[model samples]
Target: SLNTDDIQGDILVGMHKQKQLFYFFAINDPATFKTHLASDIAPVVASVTQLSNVATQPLVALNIAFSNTGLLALGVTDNLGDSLFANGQAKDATSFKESTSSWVPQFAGTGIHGVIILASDTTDLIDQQVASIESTFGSSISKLYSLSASIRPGNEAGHEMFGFLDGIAQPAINGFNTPLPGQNIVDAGVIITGATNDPITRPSWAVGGSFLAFRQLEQLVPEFNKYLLDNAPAGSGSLQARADLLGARMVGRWKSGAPIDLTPTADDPALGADAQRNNNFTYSHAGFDLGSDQSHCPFSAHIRKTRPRADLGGSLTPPNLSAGANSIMRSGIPYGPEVTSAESASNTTTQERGLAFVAYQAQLSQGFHFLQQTWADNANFPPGKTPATVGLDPIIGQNNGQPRVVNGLLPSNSSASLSIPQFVVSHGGEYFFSPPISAIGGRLSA
Candidate 1:
């Protein structure tokens, strides 16, 4: 059995919440905090939906995660041997940060010990939960940062700030039943430590725990839109048509969330909106043969760059490096506000907005770090291309001073010389562990 009672609720079955609060804090009085945590806090921590039946209500779900410092403060002595845990994401800013928007300063000296994620359908409940937590913690904890976010309103409910369908291609875990077709079902070791696919041995208490990679990415909406308009592919009919194709080619999907690999020439709003079919493509099919060519989607498209599907192997990549190892379960919401007419018209950003990028994985080294450094940041990854001029992921790739490029855009003959500019910017990040529920009241408690 999967022990739903031991795992956190949001780690597996995501709470379909409209509002969320991210409370980052440091444990000031550990002696006092630990005692209260087990007796008071543990009772409120949200476990998996299968255990609590909490998903059907507007109730605010509470889940707690700890950084390496947090674990040490709680007297945990396990040597996790995870590079991401040892060094922390603030140091990784040197590896993933862009010249323009660096995440180094915000995290260099900031001592963040733990995070409490509170989610509900309404703003009022979230506020109440936040108040309750503060009252419980009292003077034992100090706030590092308290961030708030809500899903986009109206027709843009499921979309990210960039106006793309978010949360479409999360990996399905083994032992979890009735997975959708085409969903990449990975072993439990890929998520929970001491489970099926885990590469390292952990303490007995760490069985149901998972690691989290949280990133605050800010998007320059006006700048991105202007770039789309400015760099429209030649021979496009209208300004909107030109912008649409350029944006789709850059992201590997239309605004409707349809994959360009499946619908090469046109945007399919119905297809994009269909959950059953939206995640149903392997980058290559019988007639398309797209795995060998970037004709349907650019080699550096954001989706293709991050996931790459069959582009990593079967024939295109080395036999050993498959896409399954790079899979992660993503759960995040957009922050900031809707773009205003002034910002859009001026082609410059006057507001701050983007994704609160969060993902859970068994191994941070194998997943997020690998994807960001080897694939997204490196221009020559997804290797063995005949053209040999594939570029950085325009949507997510960081360029210090070099010009960005991608190979074989749609319309086939479009040259590898096409230039791309960076759209998203990195603000800050952290690595944390969502420990098993037992650890809260047992091993991790005072």
Candidate 2:
């Protein structure tokens, strides 16, 4: 059975807030930091139970997680059992094949000891929470870097900077959440340590914890929009509609959140908005050959590459070598600002805007790490297909500054390929462990 009360609120049910701030800091005085963590932070750390209801939720919700460097600073040495988490994200940057030149200096190195995440409806409330935390910790901690994220403006609230509906295809945890239509039911151990399906042996104190993979991904919206327009699929409709179709084909979903598998040629806003119908289609169909036919959705589409639902076959279980094995609970928020008219007209991004990508999973190797290195970055992924040359993920696929290309964007011609520059640039990140509430007062503090 899962211990909901012991788990951090953000890991299972996300914190209920429009605005969130990630405050990365270094432990200047480990002894004082541990003392304050036990006395001032432990009791107030938001738990699953507290965030489940509006009544028990705080004005500003807070959850804390530590990096391997931070754990060493606190003198807690029990192995949590994941090398990616232990070594930090920078050490594995080569595996991701992304340029680290744009990474914030703090994230490029191992200076960030831990991160204090604060969420609230307003920035004012978030500031108050940070003020209180700073007051409590005093000189024991030093600020490294901080990133603030908010839901996009108005009608674009749930959409990412790329104009697509985001977070529509997350997995449902076996014990924690009920599976919605088309949602895969993943074992709790795939997310939380020591749970039913977890393969690694972890320290007892780490049982309810999850590894948080944080990446600052910058989306080049103007560049992306331009690419779609330039390579709009050959069609009889208006240019805008054709461009949108091209974008839809690349994303595996229309901007309205409708899966392209169901409504192949056109956008269905109603189907996209309907929770029951939107995610209810597998790429499999009666007339379509699963291996060759990509008329419904491209094999290298961003969503398809990330979660190839039925393409890997049905009902996959533990030690999963399939897509199910790399599932992650994505709880990220868009950061920076909406594109300016000048930038849009110029078809170039002049501002720093993108996603504060955050995902939680039990094993870094099976989750974010695998999804990036093995799936998205690999052009020949999803294995057996007719053309057998399914290109890189147009949105997030990285090629180490190499020329990136994608095939099958044109439904009319599967063999036709389009060269694309990287739109989602990696600004670097770190892996931290969000420990159970019990560990905060026990092994972590003492």
Candidate 3:
């Protein structure tokens, strides 16, 4: 059993997301930083007690999730861009290394981490939230390796900022199994702590390390719609219906975050709407192998790519993708603003909004990166006998090679891959190691 008291709130316990902005900083003085540890790390503590009382507000809200180890760890630079956000001028930095952003921005005299998500609705409570952390642990805590965004927008508007319907397709945990239709149940450890469903060698202290993947993606509004209308699936109903079908095929679910395997012929509104009911199904269609093939769901779809549920273990007890370091407790909210008249009329995406992805795992190699490179980016995943060019997650897969595209999708039965435009992107981001709960004992930085 684990002591909930020792862990950071956001890393595992959980935190409410409003209009958030994540800021990653290198602790200049761990001792001084530790003084404010209580306030800085209050959210993590709150998670241990009550449920964060995640109230919906109309004001801009922000919460900071930091680790004492990262703060003290030297060589920790500002915005160490990772590979995912590698578009020099692609204008799409959805995740880390995907964007070549320079130094981290300075806000309120802080070294601002590479990634920051601005969510609205929680309202003017941003300062108070940070103050809560400072009130207790501001001092003796030097380097601030990472901190969430400032001020988030609240209310229904707070949920979806830019445009893309996000926070969809998260799996249910073990032991909690009253699943919703089309809702998939993933390992509890996949998003929690020390419970890696994947197979990997891990360090003892690494048990609670979560993956901090940053992304700054810029959406090409016009291009996105153009492609959607141009290549509507054959025999697909209305534009909405066609779009829904295509989304289901690629994401293996609908915008409602409902998996398609359960509602392949159509997107189920009811199932998608109910959280208790949605995200409760397995991609278990007969005739379709869970491994070596993505017949039921497309290999490129975001959900499958990030987590190839049926890719491994045909010999009975198969391995899971969301295990060990591959685990990430995703915590992000959308950003930017609604579509504009000029932008909408011209079909140009002059907006921004996506998941401010935040997940923690005991290891990086086995967690987010593994899911991205080996599964999402690498395609040919979920190791089933579906299609040959089932490479790259259509929703979020990227390639350092020449513009990669998925190919060959079928209405009845797809045996080949279809080359399509890149959908999700890495705008700007970086990778960092989150410290363990014990690191808070003032031994994080020397």
For candidate 1, write residues 355-377 as lDDT tens digits. Answer: 88888887998788878888988
Ten contiguous residues with the weakest lDDT in model 2: 315-324
Alpha carbon RMSD to native, model 1: 2.8
Report the error of model 3 at residue 407, Å.
Answer: 2.8
Better of 2 and 3 by lDDT: 2
Which one wins on lDDT?
Answer: 2
1-446: candidate 3 lDDT, tens digit per residue: 34444444455434554445464544545455554443344224332223333453224332333322343243223331222212221222332224333323332222432222223434356556445544554443333433333223433432333233455544444564343433345564554435445343333444544445454444454555656666667673787677557656765666555567567667676876676655554445556555433455665666656654544432222223232224455655554565567876886565554445565554454566677667776655655444556766666677652355664344654555566665554544455444445543333322
Score residue 43 of candidate 2 by CA lDDT: 90
Candidate 2 lDDT tens digits, 418-437:
88888888899999999999
Better of 1 and 3 by TM-score: 1
Least lDDT summed over 10 consecutive residues: which range in candidate 1?
A: 313-322
TM-score of each: 0.93, 0.97, 0.71
Candidates' C-alpha lDDT: 0.77, 0.89, 0.48
Q: Is candidate 1 or candidate 2 better by lDDT?
A: 2
Candidate 2 Cα outliers beyond 4 Å, as residue runs:
315-322
Q: Higher-TM-score candidate among 2 and 3?
A: 2
